[PDB]
Design a protein around this nucleic acid. Structure first.
Ligand SMILES: Nc1ncnc2c1ncn2[C@@H]1O[C@H](COP(=O)(O)OP(=O)(O)NP(=O)(O)O)[C@@H](O)[C@H]1O
Ligand SMILES: [Mg+2]
Ligand SMILES: [Mg+2]
Ligand SMILES: [Mg+2]
Lengths: 642, 631
DNA sequence: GCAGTGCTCGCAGGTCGTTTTTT
DNA sequence: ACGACCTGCGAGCACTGCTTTTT
């Protein structure tokens, strides 16, 4: 583990950091992940720290996964390290200490779908018909800022989201209480409740801080008030906290992420040491230059840059097309050309501000028989068929999971319907009972028709499943739940239609077998992770061109990148245009992220005209193109300078 | 009219009766009806009375009409006559001028089905919720009362009951009937009764058109009617009622055996006229009839002497099953018709409408003409009824009961959920339904269609008015879109035009519907609409006051001739059914045949049956016939 | 432009009670 | 045996209103 052998000099210094706090600024391509793992390896090896004591924190599972494998190769006793998501940590903490704040065994975690359920119910009598999601987001940003239904409606300005302080705040008020009644927490709770647990019960904070003596928090620019608070609490005792971020890459301010957190970090921790990694290995010099010039525009953020390390590669180009249709045609003309130049589909990707944009693009590649992968924004990431099965699992684990019940009741159809269902629910509400136990007593207590049995059968097979969970392995249990539920059969028709949703379900079952390989482990446990998995994180690249939003692009890189619809009111989104400068800066950060993702060549497009939501209008051109004028060549349809 | 030459002395004086209450009382086929007919011809011809000045009230307008031509045969002046049922008149009383009592021009009548739609409606609300969910039970108790003139308050005050439940159900049912501005049958009377007593000034005005008052088939007559009568009369007592106690089969409907008899106590002046001779039946028939009836002990004592020589024997045949019973009647109808008997002169009498289904089949195979009475209204059939709903609701906005049946069939875009949102609009505003609908733009489409129909009601004649609705409703289009089987459905709807044109010859609009609602089973609207030489099928009940040379009585069995209902009830029910049987035999003139099966099917289950207890009564007053007549 | 949802209006399959009469 | 009834389910229509998303 010789840091000077392993790493860059500036890296080695950051990896050499030991106690007290440090800020690590990592621009793109900076080999931050490597650096940070060795530091972990150094801390244990060189400074004789304990793995028990080290906590690494990231935002995504991919990240945490990469973190854990890499560590394993390099660090002995890697098993004993706590690397996970803010959420995954939150789960772990609350599963172990929930009872101190009134969470019973075994409470449930509501995913984003499940929230809506509740929301629709609580809406019934509030001043505010419309849409329920809206409200879901209102809550989510509220819980993210660490806001309470009370101090929400104490908000100076009454219409931050449509509806008055109280009309908004009431929904959140009601949503809270019912949620709690059901014995459950949403995804933000895992952070916000955990904060509250620490704050109330400090003695609990300690028992934890013995497991988190040293702390890495990645992407500290995306961090939010609530995540901020939690981190401070964890680190408050020993101040051994190293947060790696990049201020020019906060692109989730709508998620309520606070760029100020990382800016204020050396103000928050006056003693902290600073380290800056400005070296970009990933990208071309011409790319980086474009990127660096673009970015210096954002006002008064931390003084840093992208040090080139590859020769100034191929030029950056910017074609404009009359047609938003033409640009899609234009894009395919090129992916062909380059696939012919000797360059694989995997090597190339297309980035768009909004998902809508994928269709014209997609349809264009589809005409020149060009493989396409769309990092789905319209369609769930393996989510619908996975979360269903869990609904069975989660209802089998406790029969009072009425949210789980409402969802799997439709799949497959049991011949239970709006009438039966609501009857069973009216009765249940009226006697303080689980909808499912209502099912179980349909025949015993007067629910007319001989549907009763369709209700009694469901309870019967649910409870069959419950016995199984007690007496089976995780993998076998999903084989049981799958075949008995008949999700396979209904999905076999929709499977004959699809067949894939059947496959990653088999893949899920496989991953369940992998769960029991690693040491340690309750069924309840496997499910705790699965609930957070979006996209079934654990098969090699598809060999397609990739399509994704710029937001989606973050932390990924491609030899070839296409950035499309680089126009005013698209990029530099009109919405953000209303926000004034503060908003424009955020957009600029977004544009910046794309550029930094391109390794060898970057093509840019906009249209003369574009259609959105019906009609066709004159497309303006992106002001950020000004910001980088001269650092790119404009072009006709074929690659000609003009 | 020369009474003495045309009537028996006892009859000739009875008909001669000229003022004040009088009562004729006789056994069946005695001329009570016939003498009632001559009475009319007399007062016109002899006692110089305006025919405009008399009414005879019955239990079918055909009883009346065939009754009309009769005075015409006797005295010209059959035009100015007034003859109808209580209802046909008790409706005309109210309807012609209801310019008092508080009602509104354009009201509607609620038939049995109409009734239930409100009883199914206001039923959930009040505590009789469980096995009294059965809806029919309530409309009965709602109807038996309006027959005794009872209100909800005095229904609340009763011995043994669900009591305030019953009365409230009625209380609501009414304030909801009130709402739709429609009137249950009873009302027809009751409101008639009420009105007279409400305004003693208005009633006199009628007693000018009712100078002398005839009542036939007083046998059965409810207390609502009794008071109507008692009232209609009182100005100057000029009432004759005629009837037979042994022929009182309308108990279930509140017609009081005793209601009839106490007429003497009610009226002092009443001159009781008695009749002893039977003109209608062969002696072997009457002997059986007389032999039977004697079993209703503590009934009155009349007697029936034959005027006719004893005849062909009364015969009885038991068959293997209900088919073999229908096929037998078919076979025999064929034979008799062969002897030169005409279909017109034969009839089959059963206890329950259901029994007609099978008999017909036997008749169809052979290709014998038949006409059924009061089984499956042409005016019942979907095709017709819904357009009558268009008609009801066209004129009367408030008819939600109808609104229901018409909005759906012509698929107008209209929401099951829109309904419950609009019925809430009714419930919130306390509004007539259509108005809530009038003011999701199908509401504007229905309103301009509906508004039109009623606005185009007064400019258009009924015959072409119905073709206005039928086309504009699109009810045509729906029938043409799904009309392979539906073609018979528009054929009825074409027939509905023709029957309007039949109506167009006579001077008899909304009026039309009245008739349709009030139609007796034997009334003409119901008959022609639903060859003239045809066999006639009807219920023993309907048989009342008619006669047939040849009569079949099918299904003379326990649980059926007596009826399960009557048996369960014990004696008072038996004597009633028995009296029903006596009514059966008494329609025959020459030939009576009786049948039962050994096994009858109902509800898909073929079940053993046994001969009526009644056959036992007439031990050797009938021969027992194998399928072919022998033994 | 498309999607996510409202609500219609109809196959489809099972329960049930309907027969004691009439206006 | 039959006609009404009631659910259940799912293919249709036209309604409208919206930037971006991780666990
Ligand atoms: N005096 C008579 N002269 C000739 N025919 C008569 C005489 N009285 C009755 N009839 C006939 O015998 C039958 C019985 O007459 P009708 O007046 O219908 O009997 P009813 O006493 O009214 N009994 P019901 O059948 O109970 O109504 C009819 O055909 C009459 O025309
Ligand atoms: Mg689900
Ligand atoms: Mg008579
Ligand atoms: Mg009817």
């Amino acid at each position: 583990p010789d840091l000077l052998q392993a790493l860059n000099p500036t890296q080695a210094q950051a990896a050499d950091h030991f106690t007290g706090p440090a800020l690590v600024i990592a621009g793109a391509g900076s080999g931050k992940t490597r650096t940070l793992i060795y530091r972990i390896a150094h801390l244990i090896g060189h400074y004789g720290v304990h793995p028990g004591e080290i906590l690494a924190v990231t935002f995504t599972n991919k990240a945490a996964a990469e973190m854990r494998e890499r560590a394993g190769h390099l660090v002995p006793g890697a098993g004993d390290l706590w690397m996970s998501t803010f959420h995954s940590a939150g789960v772990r903490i609350l599963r172990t200490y929930g009872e101190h704040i009134g969470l019973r065994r075994g409470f449930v975690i509501y995913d984003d779908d499940d929230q809506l359920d509740i929301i629709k119910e609580v809406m019934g009598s509030i001043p505010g018909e419309t849409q329920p999601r809206v409200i879901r987001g209102i809550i989510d940003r509220a819980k993210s800022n660490l806001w309470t239904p009370d101090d929400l409606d104490r908000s100076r300005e009454p219409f931050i989201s449509g509806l008055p302080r109280d009309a908004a705040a009431e929904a959140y008020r009601r949503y809270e209480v019912r949620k709690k009644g059901q014995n459950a927490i949403d995804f933000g709770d895992l952070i916000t409740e955990t904060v509250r647990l620490f704050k109330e019960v400090p003695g609990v904070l300690d028992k934890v801080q013995n497991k988190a003596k040293f702390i890495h928090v990645d992407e500290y620019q995306d961090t939010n008030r609530a995540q901020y608070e939690l981190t401070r609490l964890l680190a408050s005792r020993d101040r051994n906290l190293l947060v790696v971020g990049d201020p020019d890459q906060s692109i989730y301010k709508f998620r309520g992420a606070d760029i100020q957190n990382i800016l204020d970090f050396q103000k928050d921790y006056p003693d902290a040491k600073v380290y800056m990694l400005e070296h970009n290995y990933r990208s071309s010099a011409r790319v980086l230059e474009a990127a660096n010039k673009l970015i210096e525009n954002n006002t008064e953020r931390l003084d840093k840059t992208l040090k080139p390390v590859k020769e100034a590669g191929q030029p950056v180009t910017f074609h404009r097309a009359t047609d938003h249709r033409a640009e899609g045609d234009y894009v395919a003309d090129w992916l062909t050309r380059l696939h012919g130049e000797g360059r694989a589909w995997s090597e190339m990707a297309i980035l768009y501000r909004t998902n809508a944009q994928s269709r014209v693009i997609e349809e264009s590649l589809r005409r020149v028989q060009i493989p396409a992968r769309i990092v789905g924004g319209v369609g769930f990431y393996d989510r619908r068929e996975i979360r269903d099965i869990l609904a069975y699992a989660r209802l089998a684990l406790n029969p009072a999971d009425d949210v789980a019940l409402r969802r799997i009741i439709g799949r497959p159809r049991r011949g239970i319907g709006d009438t039966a269902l609501q009857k069973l629910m009216e009765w249940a509400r009226t006697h303080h009972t689980s909808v499912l136990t209502a099912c179980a007593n349909a025949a015993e207590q007067n629910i007319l028709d001989r549907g009763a049995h369709k209700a009694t059968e469901f309870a019967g097979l649910m409870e069959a499943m419950s016995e199984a969970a007690d007496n089976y392995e995780p993998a076998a249990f999903l084989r049981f739940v799958m075949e008995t539920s008949g999700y396979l059969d209904l999905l076999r028709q929709e499977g004959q239609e699809g067949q894939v949703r059947l496959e990653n379900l088999e893949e899920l079952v496989s991953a369940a077998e992998e769960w029991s390989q690693d040491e340690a482990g309750s069924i309840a446990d496997f499910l705790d992770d699965a609930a957070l998995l979006s996209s079934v994180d654990d098969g090699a690249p598809e060999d397609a061109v990739t399509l994704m939003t710029l937001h989606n692009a973050k932390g990924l890189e491609f030899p070839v990148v296409f950035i499309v619809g680089v126009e005013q009111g698209l990029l530099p989104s009109k919405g953000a245009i209303a926000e004034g400068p503060s908003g424009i800066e955020e957009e600029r950060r977004l544009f910046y992220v794309g550029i930094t993702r391109a390794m060898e060549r970057l093509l840019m497009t906009a249209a003369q005209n574009r259609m959105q939501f019906g009609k066709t209008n004159a497309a303006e051109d992106s002001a950020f193109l000004e910001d980088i004028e001269g650092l790119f060549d404009t072009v006709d349809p074929y690659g000609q300078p003009i």
